[PDB]
Short mmCIF file of N, CA, C and O in Angstrom, two decimals:
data_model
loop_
_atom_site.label_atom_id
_atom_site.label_comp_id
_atom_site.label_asym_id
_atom_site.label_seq_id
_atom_site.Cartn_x
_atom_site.Cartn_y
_atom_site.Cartn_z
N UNK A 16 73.33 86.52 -34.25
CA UNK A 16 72.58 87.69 -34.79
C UNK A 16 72.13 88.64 -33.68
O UNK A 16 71.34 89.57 -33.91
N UNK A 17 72.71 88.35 -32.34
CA UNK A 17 72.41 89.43 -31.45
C UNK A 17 72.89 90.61 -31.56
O UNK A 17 73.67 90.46 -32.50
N UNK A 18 73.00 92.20 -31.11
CA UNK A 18 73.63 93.00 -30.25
C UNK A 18 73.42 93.51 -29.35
O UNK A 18 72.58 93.02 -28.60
N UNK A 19 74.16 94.91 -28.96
CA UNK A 19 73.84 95.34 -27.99
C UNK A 19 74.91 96.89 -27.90
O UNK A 19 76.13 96.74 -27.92
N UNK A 20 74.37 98.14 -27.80
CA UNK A 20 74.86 98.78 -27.50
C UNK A 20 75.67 99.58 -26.45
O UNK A 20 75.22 99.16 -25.38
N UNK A 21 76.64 100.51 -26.15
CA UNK A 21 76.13 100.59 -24.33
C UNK A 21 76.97 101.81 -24.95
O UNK A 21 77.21 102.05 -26.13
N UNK A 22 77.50 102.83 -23.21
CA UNK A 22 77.79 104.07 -22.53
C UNK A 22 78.77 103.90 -21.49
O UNK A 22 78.57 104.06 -20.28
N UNK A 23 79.93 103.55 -22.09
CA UNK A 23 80.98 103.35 -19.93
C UNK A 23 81.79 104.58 -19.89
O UNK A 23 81.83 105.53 -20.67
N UNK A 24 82.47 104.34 -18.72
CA UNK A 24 83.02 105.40 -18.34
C UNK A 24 84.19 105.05 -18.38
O UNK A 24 84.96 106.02 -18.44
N UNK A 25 84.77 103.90 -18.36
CA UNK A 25 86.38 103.61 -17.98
C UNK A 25 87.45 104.74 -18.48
O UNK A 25 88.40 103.97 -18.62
N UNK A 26 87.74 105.45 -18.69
CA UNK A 26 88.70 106.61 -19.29
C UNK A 26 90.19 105.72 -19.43
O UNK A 26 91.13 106.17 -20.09
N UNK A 27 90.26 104.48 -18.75
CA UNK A 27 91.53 103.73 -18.82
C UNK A 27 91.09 102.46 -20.07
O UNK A 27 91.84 102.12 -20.98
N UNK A 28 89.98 102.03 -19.86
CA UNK A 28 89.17 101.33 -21.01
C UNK A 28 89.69 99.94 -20.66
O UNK A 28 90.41 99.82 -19.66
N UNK A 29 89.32 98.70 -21.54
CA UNK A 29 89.06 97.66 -21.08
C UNK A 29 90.77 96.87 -20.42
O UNK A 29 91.64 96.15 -20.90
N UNK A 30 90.50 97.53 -19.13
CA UNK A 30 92.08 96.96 -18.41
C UNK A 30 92.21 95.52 -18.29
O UNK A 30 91.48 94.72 -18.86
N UNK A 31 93.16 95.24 -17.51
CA UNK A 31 93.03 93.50 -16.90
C UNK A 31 92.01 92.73 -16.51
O UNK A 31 91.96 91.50 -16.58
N UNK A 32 91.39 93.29 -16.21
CA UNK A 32 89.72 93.21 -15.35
C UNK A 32 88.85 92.15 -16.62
O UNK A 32 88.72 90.96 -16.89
N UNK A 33 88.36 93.69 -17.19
CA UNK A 33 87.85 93.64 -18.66
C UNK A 33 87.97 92.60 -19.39
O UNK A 33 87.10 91.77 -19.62
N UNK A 34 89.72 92.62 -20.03
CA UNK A 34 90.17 91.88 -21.03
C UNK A 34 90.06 90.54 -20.69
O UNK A 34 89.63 89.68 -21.46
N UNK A 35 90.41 90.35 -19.63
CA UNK A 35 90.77 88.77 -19.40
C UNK A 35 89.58 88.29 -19.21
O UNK A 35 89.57 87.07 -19.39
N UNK A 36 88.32 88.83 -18.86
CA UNK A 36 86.94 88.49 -18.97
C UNK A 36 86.48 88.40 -20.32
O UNK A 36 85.97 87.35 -20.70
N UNK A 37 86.60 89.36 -21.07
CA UNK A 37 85.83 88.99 -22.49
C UNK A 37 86.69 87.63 -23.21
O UNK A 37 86.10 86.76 -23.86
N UNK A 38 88.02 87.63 -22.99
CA UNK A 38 88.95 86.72 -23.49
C UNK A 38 88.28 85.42 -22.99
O UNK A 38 88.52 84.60 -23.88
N UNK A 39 87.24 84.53 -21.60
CA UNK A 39 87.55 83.44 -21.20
C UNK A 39 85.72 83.46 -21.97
O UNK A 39 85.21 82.57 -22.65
N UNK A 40 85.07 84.78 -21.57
CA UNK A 40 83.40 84.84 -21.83
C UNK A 40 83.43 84.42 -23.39
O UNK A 40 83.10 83.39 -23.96
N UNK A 41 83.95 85.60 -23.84
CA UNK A 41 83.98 84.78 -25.98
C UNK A 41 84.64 84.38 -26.47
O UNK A 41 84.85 84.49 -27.67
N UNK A 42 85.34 83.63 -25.51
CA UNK A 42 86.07 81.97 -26.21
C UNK A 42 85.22 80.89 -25.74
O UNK A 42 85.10 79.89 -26.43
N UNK A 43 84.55 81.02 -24.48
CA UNK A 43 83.83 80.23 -23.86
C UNK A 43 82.66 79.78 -25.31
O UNK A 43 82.50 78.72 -25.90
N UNK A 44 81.97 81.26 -25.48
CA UNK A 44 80.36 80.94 -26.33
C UNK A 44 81.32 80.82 -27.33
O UNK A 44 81.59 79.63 -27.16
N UNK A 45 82.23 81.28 -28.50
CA UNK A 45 83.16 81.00 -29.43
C UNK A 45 82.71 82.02 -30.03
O UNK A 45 83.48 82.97 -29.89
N UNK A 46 81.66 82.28 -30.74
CA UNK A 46 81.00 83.29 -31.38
C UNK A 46 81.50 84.59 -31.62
O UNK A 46 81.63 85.35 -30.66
N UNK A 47 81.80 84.95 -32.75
CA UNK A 47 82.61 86.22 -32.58
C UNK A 47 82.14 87.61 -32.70
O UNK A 47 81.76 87.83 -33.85
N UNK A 48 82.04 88.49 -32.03
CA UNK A 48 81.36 89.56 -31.28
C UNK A 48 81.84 90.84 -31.94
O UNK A 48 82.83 91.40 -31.47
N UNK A 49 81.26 91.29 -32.88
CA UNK A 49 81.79 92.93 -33.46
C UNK A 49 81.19 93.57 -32.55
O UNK A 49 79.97 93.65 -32.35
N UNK A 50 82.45 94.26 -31.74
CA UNK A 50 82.32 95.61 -30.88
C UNK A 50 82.42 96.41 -31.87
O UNK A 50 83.16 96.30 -32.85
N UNK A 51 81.59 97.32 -31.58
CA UNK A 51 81.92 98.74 -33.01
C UNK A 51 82.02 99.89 -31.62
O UNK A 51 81.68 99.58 -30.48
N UNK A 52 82.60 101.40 -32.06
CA UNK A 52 82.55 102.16 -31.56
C UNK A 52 82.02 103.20 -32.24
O UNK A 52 81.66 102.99 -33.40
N UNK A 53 81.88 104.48 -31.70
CA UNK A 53 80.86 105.73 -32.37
C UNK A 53 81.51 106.03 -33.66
O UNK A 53 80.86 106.75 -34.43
N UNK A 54 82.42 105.69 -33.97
CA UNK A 54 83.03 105.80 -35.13
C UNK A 54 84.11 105.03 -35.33
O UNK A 54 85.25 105.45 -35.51
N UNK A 55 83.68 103.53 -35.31
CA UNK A 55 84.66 102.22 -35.91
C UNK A 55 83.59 101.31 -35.71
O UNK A 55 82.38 101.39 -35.48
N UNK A 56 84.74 100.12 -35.96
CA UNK A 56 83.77 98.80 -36.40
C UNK A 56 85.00 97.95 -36.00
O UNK A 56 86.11 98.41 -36.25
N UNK A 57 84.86 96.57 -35.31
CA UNK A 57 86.04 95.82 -34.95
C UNK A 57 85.25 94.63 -34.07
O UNK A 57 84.15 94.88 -33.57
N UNK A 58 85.89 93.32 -33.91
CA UNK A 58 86.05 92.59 -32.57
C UNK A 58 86.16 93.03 -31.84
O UNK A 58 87.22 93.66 -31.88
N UNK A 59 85.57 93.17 -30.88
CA UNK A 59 86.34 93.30 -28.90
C UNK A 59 87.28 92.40 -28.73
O UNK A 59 87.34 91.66 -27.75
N UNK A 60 88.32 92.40 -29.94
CA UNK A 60 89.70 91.75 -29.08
C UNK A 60 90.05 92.03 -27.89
O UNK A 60 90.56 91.11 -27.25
N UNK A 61 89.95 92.84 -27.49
CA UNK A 61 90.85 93.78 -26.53
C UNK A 61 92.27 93.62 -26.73
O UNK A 61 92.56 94.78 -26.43
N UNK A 62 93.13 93.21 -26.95
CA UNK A 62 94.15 93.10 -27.18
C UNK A 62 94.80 94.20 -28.25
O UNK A 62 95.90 94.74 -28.10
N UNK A 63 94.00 94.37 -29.22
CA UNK A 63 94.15 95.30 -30.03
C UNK A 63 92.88 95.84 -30.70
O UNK A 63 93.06 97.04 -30.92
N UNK A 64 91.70 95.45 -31.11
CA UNK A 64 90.44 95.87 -31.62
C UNK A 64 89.43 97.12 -30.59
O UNK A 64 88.84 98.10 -31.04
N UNK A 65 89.49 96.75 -29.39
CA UNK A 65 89.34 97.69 -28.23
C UNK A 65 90.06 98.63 -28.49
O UNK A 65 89.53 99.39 -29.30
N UNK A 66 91.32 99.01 -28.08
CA UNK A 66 92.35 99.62 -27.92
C UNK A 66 92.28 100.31 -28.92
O UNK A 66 92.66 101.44 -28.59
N UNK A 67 91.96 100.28 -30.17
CA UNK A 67 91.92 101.25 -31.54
C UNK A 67 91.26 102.42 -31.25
O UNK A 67 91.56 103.55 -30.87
N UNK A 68 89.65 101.46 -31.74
CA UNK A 68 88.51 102.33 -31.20
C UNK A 68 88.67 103.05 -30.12
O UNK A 68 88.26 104.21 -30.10
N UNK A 69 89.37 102.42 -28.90
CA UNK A 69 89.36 103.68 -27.73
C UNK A 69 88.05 103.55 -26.81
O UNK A 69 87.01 104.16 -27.02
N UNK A 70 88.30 102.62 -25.71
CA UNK A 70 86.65 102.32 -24.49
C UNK A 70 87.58 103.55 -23.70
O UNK A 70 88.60 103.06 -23.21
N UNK A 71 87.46 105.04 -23.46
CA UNK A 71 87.31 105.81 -22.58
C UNK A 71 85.71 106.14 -21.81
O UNK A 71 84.74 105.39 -21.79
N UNK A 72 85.83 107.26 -21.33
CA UNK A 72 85.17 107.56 -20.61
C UNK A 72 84.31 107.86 -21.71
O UNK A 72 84.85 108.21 -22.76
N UNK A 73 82.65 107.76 -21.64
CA UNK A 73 81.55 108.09 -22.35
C UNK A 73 81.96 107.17 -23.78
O UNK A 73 81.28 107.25 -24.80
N UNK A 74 82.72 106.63 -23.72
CA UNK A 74 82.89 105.53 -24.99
C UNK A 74 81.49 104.94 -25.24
O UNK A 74 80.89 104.34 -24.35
N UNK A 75 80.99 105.12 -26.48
CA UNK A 75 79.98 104.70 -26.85
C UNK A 75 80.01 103.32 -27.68
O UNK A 75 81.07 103.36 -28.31
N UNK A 76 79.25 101.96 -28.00
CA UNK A 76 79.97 101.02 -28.15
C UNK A 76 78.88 100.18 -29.28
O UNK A 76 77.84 100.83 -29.34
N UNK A 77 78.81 99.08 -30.07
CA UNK A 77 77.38 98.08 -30.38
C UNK A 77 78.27 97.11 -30.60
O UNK A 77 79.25 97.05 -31.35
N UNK A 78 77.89 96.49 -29.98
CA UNK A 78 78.74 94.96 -29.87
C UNK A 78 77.29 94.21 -30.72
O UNK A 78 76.15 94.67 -30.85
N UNK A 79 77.95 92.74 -31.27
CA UNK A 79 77.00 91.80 -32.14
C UNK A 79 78.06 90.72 -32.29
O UNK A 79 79.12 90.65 -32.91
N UNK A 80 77.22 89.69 -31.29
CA UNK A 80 77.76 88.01 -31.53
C UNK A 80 77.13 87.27 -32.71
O UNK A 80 75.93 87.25 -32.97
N UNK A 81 78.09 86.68 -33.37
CA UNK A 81 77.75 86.01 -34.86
C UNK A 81 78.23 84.06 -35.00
O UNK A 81 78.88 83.71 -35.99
N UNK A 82 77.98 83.43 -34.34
CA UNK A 82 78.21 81.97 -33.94
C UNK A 82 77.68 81.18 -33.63
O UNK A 82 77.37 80.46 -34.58
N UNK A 83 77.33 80.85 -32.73
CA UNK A 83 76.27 79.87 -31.89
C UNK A 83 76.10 80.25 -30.33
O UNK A 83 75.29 79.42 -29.90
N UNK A 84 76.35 80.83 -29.63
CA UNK A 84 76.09 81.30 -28.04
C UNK A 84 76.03 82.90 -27.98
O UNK A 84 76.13 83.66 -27.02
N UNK A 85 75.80 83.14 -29.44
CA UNK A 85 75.18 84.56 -29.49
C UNK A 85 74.46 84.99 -28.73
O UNK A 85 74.70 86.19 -28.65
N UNK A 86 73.61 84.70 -28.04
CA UNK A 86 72.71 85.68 -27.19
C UNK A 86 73.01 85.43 -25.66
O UNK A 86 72.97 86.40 -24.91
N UNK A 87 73.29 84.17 -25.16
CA UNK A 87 74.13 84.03 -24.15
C UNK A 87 75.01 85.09 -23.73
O UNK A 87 74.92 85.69 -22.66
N UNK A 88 76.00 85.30 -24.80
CA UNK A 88 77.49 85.80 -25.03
C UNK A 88 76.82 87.27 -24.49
O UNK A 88 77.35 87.89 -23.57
N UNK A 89 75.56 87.74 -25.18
CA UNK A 89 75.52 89.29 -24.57
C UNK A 89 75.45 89.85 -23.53
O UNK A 89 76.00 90.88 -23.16
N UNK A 90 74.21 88.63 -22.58
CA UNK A 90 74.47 88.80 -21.18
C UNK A 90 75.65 88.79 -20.82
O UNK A 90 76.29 89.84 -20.75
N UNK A 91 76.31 87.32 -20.44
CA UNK A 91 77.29 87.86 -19.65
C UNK A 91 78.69 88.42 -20.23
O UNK A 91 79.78 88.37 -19.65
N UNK A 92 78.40 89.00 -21.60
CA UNK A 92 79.12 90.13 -22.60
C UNK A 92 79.10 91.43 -21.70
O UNK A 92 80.11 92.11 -21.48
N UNK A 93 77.43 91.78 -21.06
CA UNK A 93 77.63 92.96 -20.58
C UNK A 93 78.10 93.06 -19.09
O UNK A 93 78.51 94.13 -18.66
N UNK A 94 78.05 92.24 -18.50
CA UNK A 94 78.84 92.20 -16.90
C UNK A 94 80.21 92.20 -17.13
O UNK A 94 80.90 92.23 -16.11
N UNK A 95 80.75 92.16 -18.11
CA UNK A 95 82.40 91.89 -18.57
C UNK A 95 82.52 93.49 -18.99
O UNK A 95 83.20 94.20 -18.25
N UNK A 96 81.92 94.02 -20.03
CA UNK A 96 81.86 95.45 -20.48
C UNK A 96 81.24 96.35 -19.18
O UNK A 96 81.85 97.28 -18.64
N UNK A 97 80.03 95.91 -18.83
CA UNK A 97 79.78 96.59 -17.60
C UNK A 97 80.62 96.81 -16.64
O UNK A 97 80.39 97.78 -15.91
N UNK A 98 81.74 96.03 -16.39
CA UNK A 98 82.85 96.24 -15.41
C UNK A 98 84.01 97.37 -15.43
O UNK A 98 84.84 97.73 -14.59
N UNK A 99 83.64 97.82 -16.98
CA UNK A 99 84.31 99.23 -17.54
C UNK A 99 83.85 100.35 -16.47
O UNK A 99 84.68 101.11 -15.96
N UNK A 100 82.50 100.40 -16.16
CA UNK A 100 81.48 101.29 -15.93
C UNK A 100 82.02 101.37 -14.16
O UNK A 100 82.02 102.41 -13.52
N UNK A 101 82.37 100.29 -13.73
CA UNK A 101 82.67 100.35 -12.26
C UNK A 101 83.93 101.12 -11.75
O UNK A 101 84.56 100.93 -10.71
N UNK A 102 84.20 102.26 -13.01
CA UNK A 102 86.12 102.60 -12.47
C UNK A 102 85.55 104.24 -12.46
O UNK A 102 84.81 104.60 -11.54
N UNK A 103 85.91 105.08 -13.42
CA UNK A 103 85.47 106.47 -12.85
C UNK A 103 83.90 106.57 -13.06
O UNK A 103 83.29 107.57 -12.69
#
């Protein structure tokens, strides 16, 4: 029942970096995490649920873990998404 909103900049959006982090972070807690964007609603698959919505630059985002390591998952949810923020 957590979320969490955010603001990145990646204009390339959740690359290798990213993906393969949220992939090991929310399989790790299991819990499954609706990333929404300013106008969608989805998983942070990244694989394809990211990629719809579109993490560019000023991508606006509310992620919400629904499982059991829900609130865990957000912290280090946002050092994984925060790593968007480290490119332009």
């Amino acid at each position: 029942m957590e979320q969490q909103s955010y603001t990145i900049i990646d204009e390339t959006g959740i690359h290798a970096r990213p993906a393969t982090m949220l992939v090991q972070t929310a399989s790790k807690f299991d819990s499954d995490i609706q990333l929404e964007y300013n106008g969608k609603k989805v998983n942070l698959k990244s694989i394809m649920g990211v990629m719809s919505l579109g993490v560019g630059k000023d991508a606006e985002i509310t992620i919400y873990a629904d499982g059991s390591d829900e609130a865990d998952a957000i912290q280090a949810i946002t050092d994984v998404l925060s790593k968007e923020g480290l490119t332009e």
